[PDB]
Amino acid sequence: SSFLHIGDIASLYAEGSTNGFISTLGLVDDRAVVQPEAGDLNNPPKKFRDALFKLAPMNRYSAQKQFWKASTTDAVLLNKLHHAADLEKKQNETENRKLLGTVIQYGNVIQLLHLKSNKYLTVNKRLPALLEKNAMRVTLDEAGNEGSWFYIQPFYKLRSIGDSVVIGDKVVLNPVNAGQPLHASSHQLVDNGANEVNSVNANTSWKIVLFMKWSDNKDDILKGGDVVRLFHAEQEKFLTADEHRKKQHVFLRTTGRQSATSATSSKALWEVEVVQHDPARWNSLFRFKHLATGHYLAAEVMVYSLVSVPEGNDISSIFELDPVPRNSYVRLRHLATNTWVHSTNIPIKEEEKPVMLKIGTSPLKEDKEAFAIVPVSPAEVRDLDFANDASKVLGSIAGKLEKGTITQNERRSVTKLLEDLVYFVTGGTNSLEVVFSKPNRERQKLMREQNILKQIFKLLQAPFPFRHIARLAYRVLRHSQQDYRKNQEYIAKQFGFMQKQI
Numbered sequence: 413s414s415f416l417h418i419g420d421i422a423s424l425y426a427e428g429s430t431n432g433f434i435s436t437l438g439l440v441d442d443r444a445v446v447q448p449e450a451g452d453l454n455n456p457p458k459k460f461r462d463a464l465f466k467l468a469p470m471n472r473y474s475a476q477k478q479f480w481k482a483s484t485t486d487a488v489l490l491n492k493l494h495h496a497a498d499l500e501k502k503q504n505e506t507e508n509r510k511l512l513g514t515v516i517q518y519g520n521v522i523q524l525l526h527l528k529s530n531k532y533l534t535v536n537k538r539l540p541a542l543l544e545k546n547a548m549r550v551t552l553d554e555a556g557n558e559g560s561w562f563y564i565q566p567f568y569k570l571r572s573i574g575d576s577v578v579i580g581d582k583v584v585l586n587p588v589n590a591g592q593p594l595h596a597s598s599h600q601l602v603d604n605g606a607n608e609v610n611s612v613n614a615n616t617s618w619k620i621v622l623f624m625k626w627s628d629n630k631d632d633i634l635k636g637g638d639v640v641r642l643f644h645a646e647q648e649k650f651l652t653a654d655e656h657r658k659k660q661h662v663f664l665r666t667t668g669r670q671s672a673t674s675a676t677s678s679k680a681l682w683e684v685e686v687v688q689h690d691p692a693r694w695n696s697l698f699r700f701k702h703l704a705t706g707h708y709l710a711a712e713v714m715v716y717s718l719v720s721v722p723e724g725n726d727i728s729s730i731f732e733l734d735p736v737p738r739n740s741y742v743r744l745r746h747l748a749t750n751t752w753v754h755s756t757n758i759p760i761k762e763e764e765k766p767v768m769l770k771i772g773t774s775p776l777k778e779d780k781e782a783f784a785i786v787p788v789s790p791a792e793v794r795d796l797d798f799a800n801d802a803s804k805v806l807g808s809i810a811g812k813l814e815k816g817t818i819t820q821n822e823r824r825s826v827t828k829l830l831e832d833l834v835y836f837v838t839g840g841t842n843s844l845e846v847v848f849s850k851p852n853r854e855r856q857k858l859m860r861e862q863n864i865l866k867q868i869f870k871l872l873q874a875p876f877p878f879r880h881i882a883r884l885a886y887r888v889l890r891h892s893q894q895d896y897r898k899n900q901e902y903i904a905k906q907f908g909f910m911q912k913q914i
Protein backbone atom coordinates (compact mmCIF):
# COMPACT_ATOMS: atom_id res chain seq x y z
CA SER A 413 0.00 0.00 0.00
CA SER A 414 1.80 3.11 1.31
CA PHE A 415 4.76 3.10 3.71
CA LEU A 416 6.87 5.27 6.01
CA HIS A 417 10.45 6.23 5.18
CA ILE A 418 13.62 7.83 6.37
CA GLY A 419 12.98 11.48 5.58
CA ASP A 420 9.18 11.47 5.79
CA ILE A 421 8.02 14.24 8.12
CA ALA A 422 5.17 13.01 10.29
CA SER A 423 3.34 13.86 13.46
CA LEU A 424 2.87 11.34 16.27
CA TYR A 425 -0.59 11.18 17.84
CA ALA A 426 -0.92 9.51 21.23
CA GLU A 427 -3.87 7.14 21.64
CA GLY A 428 -3.61 5.93 25.24
CA SER A 429 -5.81 7.19 28.07
CA THR A 430 -4.50 10.64 27.12
CA ASN A 431 -4.52 11.58 23.43
CA GLY A 432 -2.60 14.31 21.59
CA PHE A 433 0.25 15.29 19.29
CA ILE A 434 3.75 15.52 20.78
CA SER A 435 5.04 19.08 20.86
CA THR A 436 7.42 21.52 22.57
CA LEU A 437 6.73 24.50 24.80
CA GLY A 438 9.31 26.37 22.68
CA LEU A 439 13.03 26.97 22.08
CA VAL A 440 13.73 28.07 25.66
CA ASP A 441 12.11 25.19 27.57
CA ASP A 442 13.37 21.72 26.59
CA ARG A 443 10.32 19.61 27.49
CA ALA A 444 7.96 17.46 25.46
CA VAL A 445 4.17 17.36 25.84
CA VAL A 446 0.82 16.36 24.41
CA GLN A 447 -1.58 19.32 24.55
CA PRO A 448 -4.77 17.19 24.25
CA GLU A 449 -7.41 19.85 23.55
CA ALA A 450 -5.06 21.73 21.17
CA GLY A 451 -5.86 19.37 18.29
CA ASP A 452 -7.15 15.93 17.32
CA LEU A 453 -7.05 13.84 14.13
CA ASN A 454 -10.32 15.40 12.84
CA ASN A 455 -9.45 18.92 14.02
CA PRO A 456 -5.66 19.40 13.55
CA PRO A 457 -3.78 21.72 16.03
CA LYS A 458 -3.40 25.48 15.42
CA LYS A 459 0.39 25.77 15.66
CA PHE A 460 0.76 22.25 14.07
CA ARG A 461 4.22 23.32 12.87
CA ASP A 462 5.41 22.24 16.34
CA ALA A 463 4.08 18.65 16.23
CA LEU A 464 6.21 17.80 13.21
CA PHE A 465 9.06 15.29 13.38
CA LYS A 466 11.44 13.95 10.80
CA LEU A 467 12.26 10.24 10.86
CA ALA A 468 16.05 9.90 11.12
CA PRO A 469 18.33 6.84 10.84
CA MET A 470 20.31 5.62 13.84
CA ASN A 471 22.96 8.17 14.79
CA ARG A 472 26.54 7.40 15.90
CA TYR A 473 27.50 8.45 19.41
CA SER A 474 30.76 6.75 20.29
CA ALA A 475 33.61 9.18 19.69
CA GLN A 476 31.25 12.06 20.46
CA LYS A 477 30.37 10.52 23.83
CA GLN A 478 34.13 10.04 24.49
CA PHE A 479 34.68 13.77 23.92
CA TRP A 480 32.00 14.62 26.48
CA LYS A 481 34.58 13.90 29.15
CA ALA A 482 35.98 17.44 29.29
CA SER A 483 38.69 14.27 33.26
CA THR A 484 41.76 15.55 31.34
CA THR A 485 44.83 17.79 31.94
CA ASP A 486 46.14 17.25 28.39
CA ALA A 487 45.18 19.51 25.46
CA VAL A 488 46.28 17.56 22.36
CA LEU A 489 44.26 14.50 23.52
CA LEU A 490 41.32 16.90 23.87
CA ASN A 491 41.95 18.13 20.31
CA LYS A 492 42.46 14.52 19.25
CA LEU A 493 39.23 13.48 21.04
CA HIS A 494 37.16 16.28 19.51
CA HIS A 495 38.46 15.79 15.98
CA ALA A 496 36.93 12.31 16.10
CA ALA A 497 33.63 13.58 17.51
CA ASP A 498 33.52 15.94 14.51
CA LEU A 499 34.54 13.32 11.97
CA GLU A 500 31.96 10.96 13.44
CA LYS A 501 29.37 13.75 13.55
CA LYS A 502 29.93 14.27 9.81
CA GLN A 503 30.10 10.52 9.06
CA ASN A 504 26.52 10.39 10.34
CA GLU A 505 25.51 13.07 7.82
CA THR A 506 27.10 11.29 4.86
CA GLU A 507 25.38 8.02 5.71
CA ASN A 508 21.96 9.33 6.78
CA ARG A 509 21.74 10.87 3.31
CA LYS A 510 22.26 7.42 1.74
CA LEU A 511 19.56 5.85 3.91
CA LEU A 512 17.23 8.61 2.71
CA GLY A 513 13.94 7.34 1.31
CA THR A 514 14.33 3.72 2.47
CA VAL A 515 11.25 2.06 3.98
CA ILE A 516 11.36 1.72 7.76
CA GLN A 517 10.79 -1.89 8.90
CA TYR A 518 9.37 -2.75 12.35
CA GLY A 519 12.21 -2.96 14.79
CA ASN A 520 14.68 -0.72 13.08
CA VAL A 521 16.26 1.80 15.44
CA ILE A 522 15.31 5.29 14.25
CA GLN A 523 15.65 8.71 15.89
CA LEU A 524 12.83 11.25 15.82
CA LEU A 525 14.02 14.75 14.94
CA HIS A 526 11.81 17.70 15.92
CA LEU A 527 11.71 20.02 12.91
CA LYS A 528 10.79 23.37 14.48
CA SER A 529 13.17 23.05 17.43
CA ASN A 530 15.74 20.97 15.53
CA LYS A 531 16.42 18.92 18.67
CA TYR A 532 16.27 15.09 19.01
CA LEU A 533 13.55 13.57 21.18
CA THR A 534 15.53 11.91 23.97
CA VAL A 535 15.04 9.67 27.00
CA ASN A 536 17.39 10.54 29.83
CA LYS A 537 17.95 7.05 31.31
CA ARG A 538 19.38 8.19 34.65
CA LEU A 539 16.69 10.67 35.73
CA PRO A 540 13.25 10.91 37.22
CA ALA A 541 10.65 12.80 35.17
CA LEU A 542 9.53 16.20 36.47
CA LEU A 543 5.75 15.76 36.83
CA GLU A 544 5.66 11.93 37.01
CA LYS A 545 7.76 10.23 39.70
CA ASN A 546 8.81 6.82 38.28
CA ALA A 547 9.10 7.66 34.60
CA MET A 548 12.43 8.74 33.05
CA ARG A 549 12.93 12.34 31.96
CA VAL A 550 12.30 12.63 28.24
CA THR A 551 13.84 15.83 26.93
CA LEU A 552 14.97 17.44 23.71
CA ASP A 553 18.76 17.39 23.32
CA GLU A 554 20.24 19.25 20.35
CA ALA A 555 22.94 16.85 19.21
CA GLY A 556 21.30 13.68 20.57
CA ASN A 557 22.84 10.60 22.19
CA GLU A 558 22.31 6.87 22.74
CA GLY A 559 18.98 7.60 24.47
CA SER A 560 17.62 9.13 21.27
CA TRP A 561 17.65 5.70 19.62
CA PHE A 562 14.15 4.23 19.37
CA TYR A 563 12.98 0.79 18.27
CA ILE A 564 9.85 1.36 16.21
CA GLN A 565 7.70 -1.66 17.01
CA PRO A 566 4.10 -2.54 16.20
CA PHE A 567 1.42 -2.01 18.87
CA TYR A 568 -1.34 -4.32 17.70
CA LYS A 569 -0.16 -7.55 16.03
CA LEU A 570 -1.91 -6.69 12.71
CA ARG A 571 1.66 -6.31 11.42
CA SER A 572 4.87 -7.68 12.95
CA ILE A 573 8.67 -7.29 13.23
CA GLY A 574 10.34 -7.26 9.84
CA ASP A 575 7.09 -6.04 8.24
CA SER A 576 7.27 -2.58 6.63
CA VAL A 577 5.79 0.29 8.60
CA VAL A 578 2.61 1.44 6.86
CA ILE A 579 1.23 4.98 7.30
CA GLY A 580 -1.21 5.49 10.19
CA ASP A 581 0.05 2.39 12.03
CA LYS A 582 -0.12 2.53 15.79
CA VAL A 583 3.39 1.82 17.06
CA VAL A 584 5.23 1.78 20.35
CA LEU A 585 8.44 3.76 20.29
CA ASN A 586 10.85 2.01 22.63
CA PRO A 587 14.31 3.38 23.50
CA VAL A 588 17.24 1.12 22.63
CA ASN A 589 18.92 1.13 26.03
CA ALA A 590 17.48 4.13 27.84
CA GLY A 591 14.83 1.74 29.17
CA GLN A 592 11.08 2.23 29.20
CA PRO A 593 8.99 3.20 26.12
CA LEU A 594 7.55 6.67 25.42
CA HIS A 595 4.33 7.49 27.16
CA ALA A 596 1.98 10.45 27.08
CA SER A 597 1.16 11.50 30.66
CA SER A 598 -1.97 11.88 32.78
CA HIS A 599 -0.44 14.89 34.56
CA GLN A 600 -1.09 18.46 33.48
CA LEU A 601 1.82 20.88 33.80
CA VAL A 602 1.87 23.54 36.53
CA ASP A 603 2.04 26.43 34.04
CA ASN A 604 0.30 25.41 30.78
CA GLY A 605 -3.94 21.76 29.76
CA ALA A 606 -0.60 20.19 28.79
CA ASN A 607 0.54 16.63 29.61
CA GLU A 608 4.19 15.68 30.28
CA VAL A 609 5.50 12.87 28.06
CA ASN A 610 8.04 10.55 29.65
CA SER A 611 9.48 7.04 29.61
CA VAL A 612 7.56 4.43 31.60
CA ASN A 613 5.88 1.11 30.76
CA ALA A 614 2.26 1.97 29.85
CA ASN A 615 -0.28 1.04 27.17
CA THR A 616 0.12 4.12 24.93
CA SER A 617 -0.07 3.68 21.16
CA TRP A 618 1.43 6.23 18.78
CA LYS A 619 -0.49 6.98 15.59
CA ILE A 620 1.84 7.95 12.79
CA VAL A 621 0.12 10.74 10.88
CA LEU A 622 2.21 11.63 7.78
CA PHE A 623 2.58 15.32 6.95
CA MET A 624 5.15 15.61 4.14
CA LYS A 625 6.53 12.66 2.15
CA TRP A 626 10.33 12.41 1.90
CA SER A 627 10.04 14.31 -1.38
CA ASP A 628 10.70 17.98 -0.49
CA ASN A 629 13.68 19.19 -2.58
CA LYS A 630 15.07 22.16 -0.65
CA ASP A 631 16.63 24.62 -0.90
CA ASP A 632 15.44 23.78 -4.43
CA ILE A 633 11.62 24.08 -4.42
CA LEU A 634 9.02 26.29 -2.75
CA LYS A 635 6.88 23.94 -0.66
CA GLY A 636 4.38 24.53 2.15
CA GLY A 637 5.92 25.84 5.35
CA ASP A 638 9.00 27.45 3.84
CA VAL A 639 9.77 30.89 5.30
CA VAL A 640 10.55 33.60 2.75
CA ARG A 641 10.73 37.36 2.22
CA LEU A 642 9.05 38.94 -0.78
CA PHE A 643 11.44 41.50 -2.25
CA HIS A 644 10.29 43.91 -4.96
CA ALA A 645 11.91 43.95 -8.40
CA GLU A 646 11.24 47.52 -9.53
CA GLN A 647 10.77 49.31 -6.17
CA GLU A 648 13.61 47.29 -4.58
CA LYS A 649 11.81 46.87 -1.23
CA PHE A 650 10.84 44.05 1.13
CA LEU A 651 7.20 43.30 1.84
CA THR A 652 6.66 44.08 5.48
CA ALA A 653 3.95 43.94 8.14
CA ASP A 654 3.98 46.23 11.20
CA GLU A 655 1.75 48.82 12.91
CA HIS A 656 1.18 52.50 12.17
CA ARG A 657 -1.34 54.59 14.11
CA LYS A 658 -2.02 51.43 16.19
CA LYS A 659 -3.23 49.75 12.96
CA GLN A 660 -1.52 46.75 11.31
CA HIS A 661 -0.56 47.53 7.73
CA VAL A 662 1.09 45.61 4.94
CA PHE A 663 3.64 47.67 3.01
CA LEU A 664 6.92 47.92 1.17
CA ARG A 665 9.41 49.43 3.62
CA THR A 666 11.64 52.33 2.54
CA THR A 667 15.36 51.75 3.27
CA GLY A 668 18.36 54.06 3.80
CA ARG A 669 21.19 51.63 3.09
CA GLN A 670 23.54 51.14 0.11
CA SER A 671 22.31 47.55 -0.31
CA ALA A 672 18.69 46.51 -0.90
CA THR A 673 19.05 42.86 0.21
CA SER A 674 20.76 44.05 3.42
CA ALA A 675 17.56 45.71 4.69
CA THR A 676 16.66 42.27 6.13
CA SER A 677 14.12 42.44 8.95
CA SER A 678 12.10 39.94 11.03
CA LYS A 679 8.79 41.74 10.35
CA ALA A 680 9.45 41.06 6.63
CA LEU A 681 9.31 37.26 6.90
CA TRP A 682 6.42 35.04 5.74
CA GLU A 683 5.55 31.37 6.06
CA VAL A 684 4.30 29.65 2.90
CA GLU A 685 0.98 27.79 2.79
CA VAL A 686 0.93 25.49 -0.24
CA VAL A 687 -2.86 25.04 0.11
CA GLN A 688 -3.93 21.39 0.44
CA HIS A 689 -7.07 19.45 1.43
CA ASP A 690 -5.98 17.37 4.39
CA PRO A 691 -3.35 19.29 6.44
CA ALA A 692 -0.28 17.93 4.58
CA ARG A 693 2.68 18.76 2.24
CA TRP A 694 3.43 25.30 -8.89
CA ASN A 695 -0.10 24.72 -10.24
CA SER A 696 -2.08 25.12 -6.99
CA LEU A 697 -2.62 28.12 -4.69
CA PHE A 698 -0.71 29.70 -1.79
CA ARG A 699 -1.40 31.61 1.46
CA PHE A 700 1.18 33.83 3.19
CA LYS A 701 1.30 33.74 6.99
CA HIS A 702 3.21 36.60 8.60
CA LEU A 703 6.04 34.81 10.38
CA ALA A 704 6.12 37.38 13.19
CA THR A 705 2.49 38.04 14.24
CA GLY A 706 0.65 34.95 12.91
CA HIS A 707 -1.93 36.78 10.77
CA TYR A 708 -2.24 36.09 7.02
CA LEU A 709 -2.11 38.19 3.84
CA ALA A 710 -5.20 39.41 1.90
CA ALA A 711 -6.53 42.27 -0.26
CA GLU A 712 -9.80 43.95 0.81
CA VAL A 713 -10.99 47.48 -0.16
CA MET A 714 -7.69 50.45 -6.89
CA VAL A 715 -10.48 47.91 -6.30
CA TYR A 716 -8.60 46.32 -3.37
CA SER A 717 -5.50 46.68 -1.16
CA LEU A 718 -3.23 44.16 0.59
CA VAL A 719 -3.67 44.01 4.37
CA SER A 720 -3.41 41.49 7.22
CA VAL A 721 -6.27 39.19 8.25
CA PRO A 722 -6.23 37.60 11.74
CA GLU A 723 -7.14 34.10 10.45
CA GLY A 724 -5.99 32.29 7.30
CA ASN A 725 -9.18 30.58 6.19
CA ASP A 726 -11.29 33.17 4.38
CA ILE A 727 -10.95 32.83 0.61
CA SER A 728 -9.32 36.31 0.61
CA SER A 729 -6.01 35.02 2.11
CA ILE A 730 -5.28 32.89 -0.98
CA PHE A 731 -2.94 33.88 -3.81
CA GLU A 732 -1.70 32.46 -7.10
CA LEU A 733 1.76 32.62 -8.68
CA ASP A 734 3.09 33.54 -12.14
CA PRO A 735 6.66 33.29 -13.59
CA VAL A 736 8.05 26.23 -8.37
CA PRO A 737 11.72 26.91 -7.65
CA ARG A 738 13.54 28.49 -4.70
CA ASN A 739 14.59 32.14 -5.20
CA SER A 740 11.98 32.52 -7.99
CA TYR A 741 10.97 36.00 -9.26
CA VAL A 742 7.17 35.78 -9.55
CA ARG A 743 4.09 37.92 -10.20
CA LEU A 744 1.37 37.05 -7.69
CA ARG A 745 -2.36 37.08 -8.32
CA HIS A 746 -5.27 37.40 -5.89
CA LEU A 747 -7.79 34.63 -6.43
CA ALA A 748 -11.12 35.69 -4.88
CA THR A 749 -10.89 39.00 -6.74
CA ASN A 750 -8.74 38.18 -9.81
CA THR A 751 -6.22 41.05 -9.63
CA TRP A 752 -2.45 41.65 -9.90
CA VAL A 753 -0.53 43.05 -6.96
CA HIS A 754 0.72 46.63 -7.37
CA SER A 755 2.75 49.09 -5.30
CA THR A 756 1.92 52.74 -4.58
CA ASN A 757 3.79 55.82 -3.34
CA ILE A 758 1.14 57.25 -0.97
CA PRO A 759 2.62 56.19 2.40
CA ILE A 760 1.33 55.80 5.97
CA LYS A 761 1.39 59.65 7.08
CA GLU A 762 1.99 61.33 10.47
CA GLU A 763 5.76 60.80 10.04
CA GLU A 764 8.18 63.29 8.48
CA LYS A 765 9.63 61.48 5.44
CA PRO A 766 7.97 58.11 6.27
CA VAL A 767 8.91 54.55 5.22
CA MET A 768 5.67 52.55 4.93
CA LEU A 769 4.52 52.62 1.27
CA LYS A 770 1.02 51.18 0.71
CA ILE A 771 0.45 48.12 -1.50
CA GLY A 772 -2.85 47.40 -3.22
CA THR A 773 -3.69 45.53 -6.43
CA SER A 774 -4.86 46.02 -10.03
CA PRO A 775 -6.95 44.13 -12.65
CA LEU A 776 -4.22 45.04 -15.16
CA LYS A 777 -1.36 42.53 -15.17
CA GLU A 778 1.98 44.34 -15.06
CA ASP A 779 5.55 43.18 -15.74
CA LYS A 780 7.76 45.16 -13.33
CA GLU A 781 5.58 44.43 -10.29
CA ALA A 782 7.40 41.13 -9.76
CA PHE A 783 8.30 39.83 -6.30
CA ALA A 784 11.47 37.89 -5.43
CA ILE A 785 10.81 34.72 -3.38
CA VAL A 786 14.02 35.15 -1.35
CA PRO A 787 14.42 32.01 0.77
CA VAL A 788 15.20 32.62 4.43
CA SER A 789 17.73 30.42 6.21
CA PRO A 790 16.13 27.87 8.59
CA ALA A 791 18.56 28.95 11.31
CA GLU A 792 17.33 32.57 11.09
CA VAL A 793 13.75 31.36 11.47
CA ARG A 794 14.79 29.65 14.74
CA ASP A 795 16.41 32.88 15.92
CA LEU A 796 13.01 34.61 15.61
CA ASP A 797 11.64 31.61 17.45
CA PHE A 798 14.26 31.37 20.24
CA ALA A 799 13.69 35.11 20.73
CA ASN A 800 9.88 35.14 20.59
CA ASP A 801 10.20 32.71 23.46
CA ALA A 802 12.29 35.15 25.54
CA SER A 803 9.58 37.78 24.97
CA LYS A 804 6.80 35.64 26.43
CA VAL A 805 8.91 34.12 29.22
CA LEU A 806 9.59 37.67 30.42
CA GLY A 807 5.99 38.33 29.30
CA SER A 808 4.78 36.23 32.24
CA ILE A 809 7.62 36.88 34.74
CA ALA A 810 7.74 40.70 34.46
CA GLY A 811 3.95 40.63 34.74
CA LYS A 812 4.10 38.24 37.71
CA LEU A 813 6.65 40.23 39.75
CA GLU A 814 5.19 43.65 38.78
CA LYS A 815 2.05 42.81 40.79
CA GLY A 816 3.41 40.61 43.61
CA THR A 817 5.83 37.74 44.24
CA ILE A 818 7.31 35.04 41.99
CA THR A 819 8.06 31.45 43.03
CA GLN A 820 11.49 29.83 43.61
CA ASN A 821 10.99 27.85 40.35
CA GLU A 822 10.72 31.06 38.29
CA ARG A 823 13.90 32.86 39.41
CA ARG A 824 15.93 29.77 38.51
CA SER A 825 14.72 29.91 34.88
CA VAL A 826 14.73 33.69 34.20
CA THR A 827 18.24 33.88 35.67
CA LYS A 828 18.94 30.88 33.39
CA LEU A 829 17.34 32.74 30.44
CA LEU A 830 19.21 36.00 31.07
CA GLU A 831 22.31 33.81 30.84
CA ASP A 832 21.14 32.25 27.56
CA LEU A 833 20.56 35.67 26.04
CA VAL A 834 24.20 36.52 26.74
CA TYR A 835 25.24 33.29 24.97
CA PHE A 836 22.99 34.12 21.97
CA VAL A 837 23.66 37.81 21.19
CA THR A 838 27.47 37.35 21.06
CA GLY A 839 27.10 34.46 18.63
CA GLY A 840 28.12 31.94 21.26
CA THR A 841 31.32 33.44 22.65
CA ASN A 842 30.47 34.87 26.08
CA SER A 843 28.40 33.41 28.97
CA LEU A 844 31.44 32.02 34.66
CA GLU A 845 35.03 32.72 33.46
CA VAL A 846 35.26 34.23 29.95
CA VAL A 847 38.13 34.90 27.50
CA PHE A 848 36.55 37.09 24.74
CA SER A 849 33.28 39.03 24.11
CA LYS A 850 32.33 40.09 20.56
CA PRO A 851 28.77 41.02 19.37
CA ASN A 852 26.32 39.80 16.71
CA ARG A 853 24.38 42.23 14.49
CA GLU A 854 21.54 39.91 13.47
CA ARG A 855 20.65 39.16 17.08
CA GLN A 856 20.98 42.83 18.02
CA LYS A 857 18.51 43.98 15.32
CA LEU A 858 16.45 41.13 16.77
CA MET A 859 16.74 41.94 20.48
CA ARG A 860 15.03 45.15 19.46
CA GLU A 861 12.64 44.26 16.64
CA GLN A 862 11.15 41.47 18.74
CA ASN A 863 10.94 43.46 21.98
CA ILE A 864 13.40 41.50 24.14
CA LEU A 865 14.80 44.87 25.19
CA LYS A 866 11.35 46.38 25.86
CA GLN A 867 10.78 43.51 28.30
CA ILE A 868 14.12 43.87 30.13
CA PHE A 869 13.25 47.42 31.24
CA LYS A 870 9.66 46.50 32.06
CA LEU A 871 11.32 43.83 34.23
CA LEU A 872 13.83 45.76 36.38
CA GLN A 873 11.05 48.13 37.40
CA ALA A 874 9.13 47.71 40.67
CA PRO A 875 7.15 51.00 40.82
CA PHE A 876 4.12 52.77 42.38
CA PRO A 877 17.60 38.79 45.89
CA PHE A 878 18.70 40.69 42.76
CA ARG A 879 22.42 39.76 42.92
CA HIS A 880 21.73 37.69 39.80
CA ILE A 881 18.99 39.62 37.98
CA ALA A 882 20.01 43.25 37.98
CA ARG A 883 22.45 44.16 36.82
CA LEU A 884 22.45 40.89 34.89
CA ALA A 885 19.85 42.34 32.52
CA TYR A 886 22.15 45.38 32.30
CA ARG A 887 25.06 43.17 31.18
CA VAL A 888 22.69 41.89 28.47
CA LEU A 889 21.88 45.53 27.68
CA ARG A 890 25.65 46.14 27.77
CA HIS A 891 25.92 43.58 24.98
CA SER A 892 23.02 44.48 22.79
CA GLN A 893 24.09 48.13 22.30
CA GLN A 894 27.72 47.33 21.34
CA ASP A 895 28.93 49.34 18.29
CA TYR A 896 25.23 49.45 17.31
CA ARG A 897 24.33 53.14 16.98
CA LYS A 898 20.63 52.45 16.51
CA ASN A 899 20.31 50.14 19.53
CA GLN A 900 22.33 52.66 21.53
CA GLU A 901 19.67 55.28 20.72
CA TYR A 902 16.94 52.81 21.68
CA ILE A 903 18.38 51.81 25.06
CA ALA A 904 18.97 55.52 25.68
CA LYS A 905 15.30 56.31 24.97
CA GLN A 906 14.13 53.22 26.90
CA PHE A 907 16.30 54.35 29.82
CA GLY A 908 14.42 57.65 29.46
CA PHE A 909 11.15 55.99 30.47
CA MET A 910 13.06 53.88 33.06
CA GLN A 911 14.17 56.81 35.21
CA LYS A 912 10.70 58.37 34.85
CA GLN A 913 9.88 56.82 38.25
CA ILE A 914 11.17 60.01 39.96
Ligand SMILES: O=P(O)(O)O[C@@H]1[C@H](O)[C@H](O)[C@@H](OP(=O)(O)O)[C@H](OP(=O)(O)O)[C@H]1O
Nearest residue numbers: 666667668669675676677857896897898899
Ligand atom coordinates in the same frame (compact mmCIF):
# COMPACT_ATOMS: atom_id res chain seq x y z
O1 LIG B 1 24.20 52.35 11.03
P1 LIG B 1 23.31 53.40 11.65
O2 LIG B 1 23.40 54.77 11.01
O3 LIG B 1 23.34 53.44 13.16
O4 LIG B 1 21.80 52.92 11.32
C1 LIG B 1 21.54 51.65 10.71
C2 LIG B 1 21.40 51.82 9.18
O5 LIG B 1 22.35 52.77 8.70
C3 LIG B 1 19.99 52.22 8.73
O6 LIG B 1 19.69 53.56 9.15
C4 LIG B 1 18.90 51.28 9.26
O7 LIG B 1 18.37 50.54 8.16
P2 LIG B 1 17.16 51.14 7.28
O8 LIG B 1 17.83 52.18 6.42
O9 LIG B 1 16.65 49.94 6.51
O10 LIG B 1 16.19 51.69 8.29
C5 LIG B 1 19.45 50.30 10.29
O11 LIG B 1 18.41 49.57 10.93
P3 LIG B 1 18.44 47.96 10.87
O12 LIG B 1 19.90 47.60 11.03
O13 LIG B 1 17.57 47.53 12.02
O14 LIG B 1 17.87 47.65 9.51
C6 LIG B 1 20.31 50.99 11.35
O15 LIG B 1 20.72 50.02 12.32
